[PDB]
Amino acid sequence: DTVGRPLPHLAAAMQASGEAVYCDDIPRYENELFLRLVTSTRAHAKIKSID
Amino acid sequence: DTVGRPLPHLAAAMQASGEAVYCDDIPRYENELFLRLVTSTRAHAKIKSIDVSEAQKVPGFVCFLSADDIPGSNETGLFNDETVFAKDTVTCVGHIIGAVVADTPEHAERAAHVVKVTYEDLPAIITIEDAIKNNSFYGSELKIEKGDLKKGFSEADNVVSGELYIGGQDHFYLETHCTIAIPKGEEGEMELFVSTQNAMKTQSFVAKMLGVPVNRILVRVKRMGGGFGGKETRSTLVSVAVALAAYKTGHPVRCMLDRNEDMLITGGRHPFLARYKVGFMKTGTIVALEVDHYSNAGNSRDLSHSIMERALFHMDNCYKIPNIRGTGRLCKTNLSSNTAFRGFGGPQALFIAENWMSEVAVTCGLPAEEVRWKNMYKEGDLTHFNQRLEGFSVPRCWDECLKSSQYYARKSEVDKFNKENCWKKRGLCIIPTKFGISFTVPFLNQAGALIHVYTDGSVLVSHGGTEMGQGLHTKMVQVASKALKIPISKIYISETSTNTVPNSSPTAASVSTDIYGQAVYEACQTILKRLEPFKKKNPDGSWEDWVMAAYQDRVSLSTTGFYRTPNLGYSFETNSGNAFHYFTYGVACSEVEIDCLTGDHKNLRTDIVMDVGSSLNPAIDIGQVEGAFVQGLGLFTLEELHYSPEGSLHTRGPSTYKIPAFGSIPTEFRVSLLRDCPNKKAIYASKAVGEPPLFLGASVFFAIKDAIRAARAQHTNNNTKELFRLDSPATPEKIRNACVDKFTTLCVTGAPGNCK
Amino acid sequence: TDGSVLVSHGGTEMGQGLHTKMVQVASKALKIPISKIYISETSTNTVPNSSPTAASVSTDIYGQAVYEACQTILKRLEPFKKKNPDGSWEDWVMAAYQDRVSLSTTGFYRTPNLGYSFETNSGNAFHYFTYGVACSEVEIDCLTGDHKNLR
Amino acid sequence: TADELVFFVNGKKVVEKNADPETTLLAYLRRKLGLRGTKLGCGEGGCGACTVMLSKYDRLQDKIIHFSANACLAPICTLHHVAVTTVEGIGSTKTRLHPVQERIAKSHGSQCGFCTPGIVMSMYTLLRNQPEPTVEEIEDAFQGNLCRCTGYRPILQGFRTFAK
Amino acid sequence: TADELVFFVNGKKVVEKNADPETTLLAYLRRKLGLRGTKLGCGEGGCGACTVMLSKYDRLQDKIIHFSANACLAPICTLHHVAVTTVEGIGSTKTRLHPVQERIAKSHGSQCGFCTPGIVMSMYTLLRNQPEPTVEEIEDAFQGNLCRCTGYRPILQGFRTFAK
Amino acid sequence: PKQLRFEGERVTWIQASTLKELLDLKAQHPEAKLVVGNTEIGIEMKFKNQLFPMIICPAWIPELNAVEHGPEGISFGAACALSSVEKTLLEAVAKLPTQKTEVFRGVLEQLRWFAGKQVKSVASLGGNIITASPISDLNPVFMASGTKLTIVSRGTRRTVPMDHTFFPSYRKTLLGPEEILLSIEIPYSREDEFFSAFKQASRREDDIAKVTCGMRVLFQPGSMQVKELALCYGGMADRTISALKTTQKQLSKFWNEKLLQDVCAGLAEELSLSPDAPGGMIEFRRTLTLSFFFKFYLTVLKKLG
Ligand SMILES: Cc1cc2nc3c(=O)[nH]c(=O)nc-3n(C[C@H](O)[C@H](O)[C@H](O)COP(=O)(O)OP(=O)(O)OC[C@H]3O[C@@H](n4cnc5c(N)ncnc54)[C@H](O)[C@@H]3O)c2cc1C
Ligand SMILES: Nc1nc2c(c(=O)[nH]1)N[C@H]1C(S)=C(S)[C@@H](COP(=O)(O)O)O[C@H]1N2
Ligand code: HPA
Ligand code: MOS
Ligand code: MOS
Ligand code: FES
Ligand code: FES
Ligand code: FES
Ligand code: FES
Missing domain, CATH: 1.10.150.120 ([2Fe-2S]-binding domain)
Structure with missing residues (x-):
């Protein structure tokens, strides 16, 4: 029974050793592509065209 | 409500478009490596050395893996009598010694070929006869006995004794064994994509070899390109190796076997040798039977004991025999370990039964159908293992098959053909079958499901069963849809996984529809109970309305379901307790024409009548009957494995191993499902269909044996009651050799000889 | 069937140590060491319709869900415990498996008595309140606007 | 100092600058082009799991001709100016x-x-x-x-x- | 005739035959070498999530020197004959x-x-x-x-x- | 159309555009391996783990793809696909009198349940011949019919009828290391000439012990008196063989029961297999050699009468 005990965060050791996997740490598939958002530079505007 | 409707297999369109993903179709990670097994070329030998010097010169070579590389345990297999990688000795020709890992499958292949092994040969045992002579068996004798054999034989008018052999069979699933193992690099975690019927054992065996808890290992199965029992246990041979490579390298690793590796390494159906003695009256009524069975089990136990148990349960076929003793022994040999194959010992035992029954009819000089009919069980009879036959439908199938196949009329036509033809002959036979439904191991008769309802009303079902082409997922969707009273378009099953339903039995024994159907049904009942208050408040609302009301009222929309088959547990020590939940029945009539000069034959017409209760899906069920029958046709007439005297398999691909082809099937091929025979014991009154029909393929074998009899009456002797041994499979060699004439004897040359 | 336990719950780990707490909870409830329990990830195919991991209540609510599921497991194991009282967790799990008792369960918790109305100013808005006090001392540099947090 | 290998797959041009003579069409389709509808069932011509359609303009007969072939046995080096159609092509x-x-x-x-x-x-x-x-x-x-x-x-x- | 870039990462020799001047050490470690312990948190030198240790032989003070650096701003082209140590190296x-x-x-x-x-x-x-x-x-x-x-x-x- | 060169990690492939280029390359590298359909070479590399560092592909060369109708028979370039052979022969059979198509009909019988459409569309005629498998279904037909082979190298050109001498040993042909097979002429049948071909309907070993045969008889004009007899068998030895001892004894004998007996006695002896012969099925194979001749014997009688 560890309830009430100061048990370290279970992933802490793997986090210190860089073994903990975060989303971008997942290996890429051979055919994996990459996305970048195109974003408004105006607070309020009609979009006339996109080139 | 689609239950009872011929809905196409849910993935059929995707399979026809090449969009359905099988294990090796999964995209590769950028860093993914490939594994190729290194395998023994000797039946029995000490390993003196393994030389990897030349393999290391192959571009893209990563490493060679052996037993020394295993972090946890090198002990594996169902009974812990196998190695992951052979250490000191090899005990069959495809015994896994190690593996090569490389950057491409071509490079892995190249490197594995250049690995040199040095051996010191040991005395090997290859044949059942070898094993018998050497007392080389796994465990002791299995036996079922009823009545008094001395006495039965005293009362008999005639006695016939003999010996029979039935060769094994390669599964020849179109998709060979395949595993991808992805190491996460945290806490021993690994995710595996596997072509397996047994995710639970895959998970267990991987965990054991790595020495990590089972909770670290996730096994996922979307679908298999065929299993037929061959992926029930032997899939772990590849899975465990790939997992070790993933562990050792820290990269994703995959392996898919080449056909020739798969045929050599993974095992097949058990060959059986039987020695039998039957006592009978001049009427054809059976009074005593004694059968000793021996299976060629190969170099580990695996499922061999349960297979032999199932064989002993089916040695009666459909016949009442008051004095009976069957025994079975498992031969321990230097051949790849044999395993489950559709029918699981049943087809072998049923073949042996039909063989002696055919000899009874010949010896009595009576029509075969008459002798079979006379000896058939009745409703409510006890089997040799004391189980009551409730709902015994063989008589109905028999009479329907006789009528619809026009047996008696065609029998006259076969006789007319044989009168008018000298070097070709026809044969015709009608055979019944019964097949016990349930795992022979009582604890495996359990099933789980997990159902989620999402807030748009869409439903995700997961169950312990795996899809291998039998249409299990389709049937489960039909069941869920009926149970919940919503369209099938609202229900989806994605895959089988160990993190959704744990501890699942292998998808096997033909009972998956029954047990997972029940588990899904129960989960569905829970959901319905939870939604009932919302339905009551809003009776003209939609499913979507009720689901959203439940969600907003904080009612859980996720549940497990579980089913355990009741009243099971046979005792070999009391010869009592139910071995099976119920029985599936069927009858098949087949006609053939043989070329007495070449041993070639044509399958002219087959009629099948099967009792499948009230079919959940007649299209899937008819497809199962046709498929099983053709595999049985292969077993008894086409498929032949051949080994060198040193125990090395010769037949390792489609060029040398012939499974049924488009051109092999009967010209007229008719299947009927019996009408108005609901099964009270299973989901929506249905019955298991996967395995029961395979033995009906033997109708072709016994039609061939009929034609041979006519050939022998033409050209060999004048003895109408002569018994000749015809082993299975009835290949052109066996058929030709059986047609003894002026050519086989060399009488055509002027020599004297043993023909007319 | 080795007795290792896999726990899934609707909550996500973002550094707050929720999975650690859930393992501590499960270990206490099951009366087995934390080394036997693992939480691998959060997924929509294990626990559907999950609330966001938010409002500081994940420990309270998933803790209760995990607790309830553990209680179900204990009830199912109880007969096997009584048959083998000097046996181990692993023996009891395998006996249960071989007797075809399910070793999988859901757990669910719904916070009671919540329902404030802005049109009546009544009904509980919260389950309970968390409280605290802080005392801080600073030194400011009146010529630069910089400050030091002293204590 | 090798020539470019040029063939078509489902109507789309493939230019392979470093064709290895050992590469089978099945390997190329599955592991270079990522078209996994075509399957490996045996690797020896017996099973047809890898069946594709080949088409070419036949200079002897003039005719465009269309025929089936086993991708497991076809070297890509035989396929210069040949069009391949797989299951995803139709x-x-x-x-x-x-x-x-x-x-x-x-x-x-x-x-x-x-x-x-x-x-x-x-x-x-x-x-x-x-x-x-x-x-x-x-x-x-x-x-x-x-x-x-x-x-x-x-x-x-x-x-x-x-x-x- | 572009020169080889040679450096070491966790004691292991890296020979880059086709180095792009625009490539950061962080991109190289994560996406070529697959060493994902070093993180992108900002890409502008302010957060230190991408901190690695660099070591080199200092021709001036003789000695081997060790210092910290942001992999997100280090051009790999600055690293010829430098030893990189990451979290996985220790x-x-x-x-x-x-x-x-x-x-x-x-x-x-x-x-x-x-x-x-x-x-x-x-x-x-x-x-x-x-x-x-x-x-x-x-x-x-x-x-x-x-x-x-x-x-x-x-x-x-x-x-x-x-x-x- | 020009010569192309492909270079692999182990193998160099040359795609030859003309016959002259091919003969030059073959003279430059006698050990260079020819590949047309790769239906044998692919298996050898994959399963028999052979390596051929130099490969030439002659499939583009006119000649080698040519189909020519001549006075004595139909000539096929050696690179002609078996499907093209089958098509051409099926047309010849539909168009010509039965008595001229006995050999064509035998070829077609051997092509009936032979592989699949996939294999027959790429497998060449010349490749089957030169592969020289003991269990080739075509070589016994070509041998029994005296099909003519045109064989060429830089400088040399010769035409030989295929006979027993063409297959000296296991998987070997009577070609020089620099020679290539250019074309194959399948003969028209003459008056009083009859042909049959048969094959075992089982195969159990990769390239041995499957019985297949070509059988030919030529009578003296308008009689049942044997002028020529040829019985050739695959799957009875390490190569395609002729039962020369047996057939030689039948010359000027009449087509009757006595000939049937003598041939059968001869075949049982000449083709006898040892108990330990590779491939086993010893009794079955002997029985087939005799039963096939019997079928031929009765067919010839129906064709005579
Ligand atoms: C599934 C399948 C089933 C088969 N079934 C049968 C069967 O039932 N009966 C039967 O008899 N055969 C059968 N075969 C064999 C088939 O007929 C041969 O493999 C085929 O004809 C070889 O031709 P290829 O163009 O593919 O030869 P390749 O593999 O390209 O070459 C074959 C050999 O011939 C040499 N060669 C090719 N052309 C020439 C040339 N013109 N001059 C000199 N040498 C040359 C090559 O160097 C090589 O040694 C089968 C093959 C397959 C794959
Ligand atoms: N298409 C297909 N049908 C098949 C199989 C298979 O692998 N593929 N396996 C057979 C075997 S061995 C069994 S036990 C049953 C298992 O499926 P079920 O329990 O869902 O009938 O399917 C049978 N039918
Ligand atoms: O009866 C069985 N027992 C165990 N495994 C099986 N697979 C098929 N049938 C069985
Ligand atoms: O029980 Mo089927 O997997 S042999
Ligand atoms: O409730 Mo915290 O996610 S703002
Ligand atoms: S091999 Fe399974 S559908 Fe044909
Ligand atoms: S930023 Fe989360 S632990 Fe430091
Ligand atoms: S994979 Fe079987 S014929 Fe190509
Ligand atoms: S990523 Fe923030 S300093 Fe480099």
Whole structure:
């Protein structure tokens, strides 16, 4: 029974050793592509065209 | 409500478009490596050395893996009598010694070929006869006995004794064994994509070899390109190796076997040798039977004991025999370990039964159908293992098959053909079958499901069963849809996984529809109970309305379901307790024409009548009957494995191993499902269909044996009651050799000889 | 069937140590060491319709869900415990498996008595309140606007 | 100092600058082009799981010709100026299935589905050579394709609709 | 005739035959070498999530020098004959943790864990120059490392154990 | 159309555009391996783990693809696909009188349940011949019919009838290391000439012990008196063989029961297999050699009468 005990965060050791996997740490598939958002530079505007 | 409707297999369109993903179709990670097994070329030998010097010169070579590389345990297999990688000795020709890992499958292949092994040969045992002579068996004798054999034989008018052999069979699933193992690099975690019927054992065996808890290992199965029992246990041979490579390298690793590796390494159906003695009256009524069975089990136990148990349960076929003793022994040999194959010992035992029954009819000089009919069980009879036959439908199938196949009329036509033809002959036979439904191991008769309802009303079902082409997922969707009273378009099953339903039995024994159907049904009942208050408040609302009301009222929309088959547990020590939940029945009539000069034959017409209760899906069920029958046709007439005297398999691909082809099937091929025979014991009154029909393929074998009899009456002797041994499979060699004439004897040359 | 336990719950780990707490909870409830329990990830195919991991209540609510599921497991194991009282967790799990008792369960918790109305100013808005006090001392540099947090 | 290898796959040009003579078409399709509808069932010409259609302009006969082949045995180095059609070339559930794909699916001629692409390509090739075949030509079209699940009856019954 | 770039990463030789001047060390480590312990947190030098240790032979003061750097701003083209050390180069849960890794973990200095490798590398670098630092030197080592979770107290407390 | 060169990690491939280029290359590198359909070479590399560092592909060369109708028979370039051979022969059979198509009809019988459409569309005629498998279904037909082979190298050109001498040993042909097979002429049948071909309907070993045969008889004009007899068998030895001892004894004998007996006695002796012969099926194979001749014997009688 560890309830009430100061048990370290279970992933802490793997986090210190860089073994903990975060989303971008997942290996890429051979055919994996990459996305970048195109974003408004105006607070309020009609979009006339996109080139 | 689609239950009872011929809905196409849910993935059929995707399979026809090449969009359905099988294990090796999964995209590769950028860093993914490939594994190729290194395998023994000797039946029995000490390993003196393994030389990897030349393999290391192959571009893209990563490493060679052996037993020394295993972090946890090198002990594996169902009974812990196998190695992951052979250490000191090899005990069959495809015994896994190690593996090569490389950057491409071509490079892995190249490197594995250049690995040199040095051996010191040991005395090997290859044949059942070898094993018998050497007392080389796994465990002791299995036996079922009823009545008094001395006495039965005293009362008999005639006695016939003999010996029979039935060769094994390669599964020849179109998709060979395949595993991808992805190491996460945290806490021993690994995710595996596997072509397996047994995710639970895959998970267990991987965990054991790595020495990590089972909770670290996730096994996922979307679908298999065929299993037929061959992926029930032997899939772990590849899975465990790939997992070790993933562990050792820290990269994703995959392996898919080449056909020739798969045929050599993974095992097949058990060959059986039987020695039998039957006592009978001049009427054809059976009074005593004694059968000793021996299976060629190969170099580990695996499922061999349960297979032999199932064989002993089916040695009666459909016949009442008051004095009976069957025994079975498992031969321990230097051949790849044999395993489950559709029918699981049943087809072998049923073949042996039909063989002696055919000899009874010949010896009595009576029509075969008459002798079979006379000896058939009745409703409510006890089997040799004391189980009551409730709902015994063989008589109905028999009479329907006789009528619809026009047996008696065609029998006259076969006789007319044989009168008018000298070097070709026809044969015709009608055979019944019964097949016990349930795992022979009582604890495996359990099933789980997990159902989620999402807030748009869409439903995700997961169950312990795996899809291998039998249409299990389709049937489960039909069941869920009926149970919940919503369209099938609202229900989806994605895959089988160990993190959704744990501890699942292998998808096997033909009972998956029954047990997972029940588990899904129960989960569905829970959901319905939870939604009932919302339905009551809003009776003209939609499913979507009720689901959203439940969600907003904080009612859980996720549940497990579980089913355990009741009243099971046979005792070999009391010869009592139910071995099976119920029985599936069927009858098949087949006609053939043989070329007495070449041993070639044509399958002219087959009629099948099967009792499948009230079919959940007649299209899937008819497809199962046709498929099983053709595999049985292969077993008894086409498929032949051949080994060198040193125990090395010769037949390792489609060029040398012939499974049924488009051109092999009967010209007229008719299947009927019996009408108005609901099964009270299973989901929506249905019955298991996967395995029961395979033995009906033997109708072709016994039609061939009929034609041979006519050939022998033409050209060999004048003895109408002569018994000749015809082993299975009835290949052109066996058929030709059986047609003894002026050519086989060399009488055509002027020599004297043993023909007319 | 080795007795290792896999726990899934609707909550996500973002550094707050929720999975650690859930393992501590499960270990206490099951009366087995934390080394036997693992939480691998959060997924929509294990626990559907999950609330966001938010409002500081994940420990309270998933803790209760995990607790309830553990209680179900204990009830199912109880007969096997009584048959083998000097046996181990692993023996009891395998006996249960071989007797075809399910070793999988859901757990669910719904916070009671919540329902404030802005049109009546009544009904509980919260389950309970968390409280605290802080005392801080600073030194400011009146010529630069910089400050030091002293204590 | 090697030449470029140039062939077409489902209507799209492939330029392979470093063709290895050892590379099979099946390997190229699956592991370079990522077209995994075409399957490995044996690697020795017996099973037809890897069946594709090849087309070329035949300089002896003038004719454009269309024929089936086993991708497991075809070196890519034989394919300069040849067009390859795979199962994904003729139709899909995301556009429209070809009648060959529709028929086999709806006639219950696909169980595990592993042989289905190969059978689809054999039937497609026949129809591209003979828009109205006989029942006889149809059965003979499949000597090179094996199916372990179906017992063949439903595949033939489905495709018989194309005859006469 | 573009030159080879040669450097070392965790004791292992890297020969880049086709180095692009625009490539950062962080992109190289993560996306070519597959060493994902080093993190992108900003890409502008302010957060230290991408901290690695660099070592070189200093022709001037003779010695091998060790210093910390942001992999997100280091052009790989600056690294010819430099040795790179990352978090995976100092210890792991599979073999043995370095004291720095063990202490931050056990001291509750890691919550989400995203800044932890960078902070480990900052502390490791300090100890490689000064194996017995002062409390004052310890806090100074972390001016370029941000943590959003811990409030910093437990990290300083765990590393104070290295002082005197 | 020009010569192309492909270079692999182990193998160099040359795609030859003309016959002259091919003969030059073959003279430059006698050990260079020819590949047309790769249906044998692919298996050898994959399963028999052979390596051929130099490969030439002659499939583009006119000649080698040519089909020519001549006075004595139909000539096929050696690179002609078996499907093209089958098509051409099926047309010849439909168009010509039965008495001229006996050999064609035998070829077609051997092609009936041979592989699949996939294999027959790429497998060449010349490749089957030169592969020289003991169990080739075509070589016994070509041998029994005296099919003519045109064989060429830089400088040399010769035409030989295929006979027993063409297959000296296991998987070997009577070609020089620099020679290539250019074309194959399948003969028209003459008056009083009859032909049959048969094959075993089982195969159990990769390239041995499957019985296949070509059988030919030529009578003296308008009689049943044997002028020529040829019985050639695959699957009875390590190569395609002729039962020369047996057939030689039948010359000027009449087609009757006595000939049937003598041939059968001869075949049982000449083709006898040892108990330990590779491939086994010893009794079956002997029985087939005799039963096939019996079928031929009765067919010839129906064709005579
Ligand atoms: C599944 C399948 C089933 C088969 N069934 C049968 C069967 O039932 N009966 C039967 O008899 N055969 C059968 N075969 C064998 C088939 O007929 C031969 O493999 C084929 O004809 C070889 O031709 P290829 O163009 O593919 O030869 P390749 O593999 O390209 O070459 C074959 C050999 O011939 C040499 N060669 C090729 N052309 C020439 C040339 N013109 N001059 C000199 N040498 C040359 C090559 O160097 C090589 O040694 C089968 C093959 C397969 C794959
Ligand atoms: N298409 C297909 N049908 C098949 C198989 C298979 O692998 N593919 N396996 C057979 C075997 S061995 C069994 S036990 C049953 C298992 O499926 P069920 O329990 O869902 O009937 O399917 C049978 N039918
Ligand atoms: O009866 C069985 N027992 C165990 N495994 C099986 N697979 C098929 N049938 C069985
Ligand atoms: O029980 Mo089927 O997997 S042999
Ligand atoms: O409730 Mo915290 O996610 S703002
Ligand atoms: S994979 Fe079987 S023929 Fe190509
Ligand atoms: S559908 Fe499974 S092999 Fe044909
Ligand atoms: S990523 Fe923030 S300093 Fe480099
Ligand atoms: S632990 Fe989360 S940013 Fe530092």
